[PDB]
Amino acid sequence: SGLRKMAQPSGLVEPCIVRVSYGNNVLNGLWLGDEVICPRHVIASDTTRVINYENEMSSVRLHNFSVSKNNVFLGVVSAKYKGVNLVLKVNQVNPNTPEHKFKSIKAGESFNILACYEGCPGSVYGVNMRSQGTIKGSFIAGTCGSVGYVSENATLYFVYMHHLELGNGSHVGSNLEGEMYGGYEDQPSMQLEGTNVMSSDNVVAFLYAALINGERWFVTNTSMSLESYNTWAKTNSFTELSSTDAFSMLAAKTGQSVEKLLDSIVRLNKGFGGRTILSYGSLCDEFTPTEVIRQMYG
Amino acid sequence: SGLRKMAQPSGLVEPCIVRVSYGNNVLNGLWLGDEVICPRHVIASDTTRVINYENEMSSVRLHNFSVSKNNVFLGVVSAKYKGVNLVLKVNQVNPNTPEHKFKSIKAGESFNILACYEGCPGSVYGVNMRSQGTIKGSFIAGTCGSVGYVSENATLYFVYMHHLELGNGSHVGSNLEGEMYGGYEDQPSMQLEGTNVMSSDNVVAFLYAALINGERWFVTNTSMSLESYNTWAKTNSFTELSSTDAFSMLAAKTGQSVEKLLDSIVRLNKGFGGRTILSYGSLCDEFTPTEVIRQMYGV
């Protein structure tokens, strides 16, 4: 059964993806109602140098936009900035607009990515929000505007829109309100990502999933207290756990309390010694405790 | 730019999933036209012991069936075995039936699993068919009838329907014609999966994806001839490579010949030595050459 990333189904999101073109830039937009949200960098005359966005807005011609989906051409009637996103009002309303809210994702939380290639949905996969506000996915040219989403209790939330990839390979996007996650600039810059902080909540859930998979070599007879682990975590770029309550079910099923896995984290952070855990060679923090519980038990 | 096991979008498949129940057994079915296809063990009176399907079919009653989708219910007017699958005719044609075909999956090929629970699609993810006709899915209770599909050249193929989980954890399903992959029986028995043979085509593609993503510690000034690797492959449960021509473009982009990666495989098979390749601590044959080329370069 192992442990793998899953994506919630994409049915409600795909009919909202449109191809947005301006000049030499071709990417994706999110068509909801008569609005189309896209990364505002699409109207940049040159993405190899610093962009003055209000200068580009004052020189924008709505007749140069090309917003389409399949065989429907959407005429742009108004353009406005909203943060780092471009909000374009079109002459047609999306007949397949789903009931939806807008939500911001926090660090250590999982969501789904509908990877779209120049207006065409191509694939869908699950990601996780790193401490600095980035994610580790797979984006290439023409995939900006790809939408992140998550369904909670039958409520569809749009949470992410892709903008850029940093030099270290981390991927940077914004919420649908135009606020960039982690506060990164939407410029072709050399800006750095901070030091990454592993979510210890997720590493413990990852280690519980490995015990359910019959992988127990990393568990010894040594325990480590919560307080002592939290003192170790802040000097080793791990978050501190508030409590062990979230793992009550996983601990009873596997026969290992959180304190046993906390000791494993400290030992395995120095290297797996040549062995693997769920095919990984390092600690994985992309699975929340709720994810692991649902994937293993439903 | 990254490498992730991806699934194709599920929008054309979700409206075809239905809940299928009979007595105390509940699973998923595939609603196309006025036909619903499900695993036949939904009518088994006892999943605990060996099932006599001839007795179960003789004592079946159409009205004891219940197939439904979003509070709308379908009446079963006919039930028939087709291989290990039940084919039920219902009194309503699926208005969202997509243009589709049926197809079998070969070893080493990738397809998409739409995991479902009691007729409600829950998650979608990509899998790769292992050499013995199994997949390392994540099916748990109530996921029987979950549908595998693949989109090729704008043609939708239904390729998989979930049945059981072997004692070793591997997952066995059938195609949509009732033929179980790998020849396993739909019986609660201790069937043993054969020896897994790693797809060398997929491992090479995985290592090419690593080079594209900046991983290169596993390549040295060494390179292994194709025949020399194939002789090693038949000894260490790896597929033999007919040629290197499927990697012509990947070899040009990364400047690394297949032969250089062939020696990497032989060395890496003995362990990574504490190093990683795109988070992996072991070789992974879950990505085809076509998967990698498309994910890295768009195409």
Ligand SMILES: *C(=N)[C@H](C[C@@H]1CCNC1=O)NC(=O)[C@@H]1[C@@H]2[C@H](CN1C(=O)[C@@H](NS(C)(=O)=O)C(C)(C)C)C2(C)C
């Ligand atoms: C959207 N269409 C792309 C997605 C990129 C392409 C490679 N991987 C991705 O995630 N975004 C951009 O093209 C984005 C646009 C221009 C430059 N840019 C980048 O992502 C660059 N990275 S960076 C932070 O060094 O500028 C690069 C080098 C193209 C990956 C702007 C930031 C406006």
Ligand SMILES: *C(=N)[C@H](C[C@@H]1CCNC1=O)NC(=O)[C@@H]1[C@@H]2[C@H](CN1C(=O)[C@@H](NS(C)(=O)=O)C(C)(C)C)C2(C)C
């Ligand atoms: C469908 N609802 C299940 C899917 C299973 C549940 C656990 N993981 C899965 O993939 N199918 C069955 O329950 C299936 C039914 C009965 C026995 N069976 C199994 O998968 C069993 N495995 S085995 C090969 O030992 O019989 C088991 C013990 C439930 C996992 C039959 C084959 C009819």
